[model samples]
Target: ACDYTCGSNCYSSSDASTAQAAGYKLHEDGETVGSNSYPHKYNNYEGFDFSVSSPYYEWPILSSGDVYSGGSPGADRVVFNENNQLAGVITHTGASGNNFVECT
Candidate 1:
């Protein structure tokens, strides 16, 4: 997923919220994701998906919900501030479908 991080490959997906599912399409901190390198932080794993619009490259307008699931890279966590509050979001920009986070 890092391969797409901050790159020009992230995209958004559209799906109305489901009663029994995570309304969002961008998932983060799951099993597939690993630790940070360039500048590491509180994220070590990846396996999250959120519900947002198309073209993840376009944030906020593309972000809509938060989600999680059972998969590889086992770890699910959202960005937080030093105060331990929800802070930022993670967007993968090299692939499409199943993986996104909200920042706005």
Candidate 2:
């Protein structure tokens, strides 16, 4: 099972909600998902395939204790707040990049 208890990469909406108060929505829900009627479904993990749409970037699906480092030297970086908890990820989609977060 995936651990969405923490980290910026949550598997499902149910997984990310608890942390939403911490600022997960800005990266996942685009502007505001507003209660539940959210339009898009959250990514299951890097196990699936997806393409950019809009209003948000693909939510990263990292396993517990994992981090994204596959990008180029400066292509991606994880951000953490004062408590060492995930703040968010800074990723560049390369040239023609939409500055979206494609995850796995």
> Which candidate number has the best lDDT?
2
lDDT of 2: 0.34
Which candidate achieves the best TM-score against the true structure? 2
lDDT of each: 0.28, 0.34
lDDT (10s digit) by residue, model 1, range 1-104:
22112343232322112201231222222222223211124332344343432222111212223332322211222343233233334544333554544322
In candidate 2, the residue pairs with backbone N, CA or C atoms under 3 Å apart (3 or more residues apart, or in different chains) clash, namely: 46-104
Model 2 residue 81 distance off true place after TM-score fit, in angstroms: 0.8
Give per-residue lDDT, candidate 2, residue 16: 40
Candidate 2: stretches off by over 4 Å: 1-72, 94-102
lDDT of 1: 0.28
* Predicted candidate 2 versus true structure: per-residue lDDT over 1-104, tens digit per residue: 53322323335434343333333444443553334322223332333232323223222323342332233223333333323244343344432443434323
TM per candidate comes to 0.23, 0.24
Tell me the deviation in Å of residue 88 in model 1: 1.0
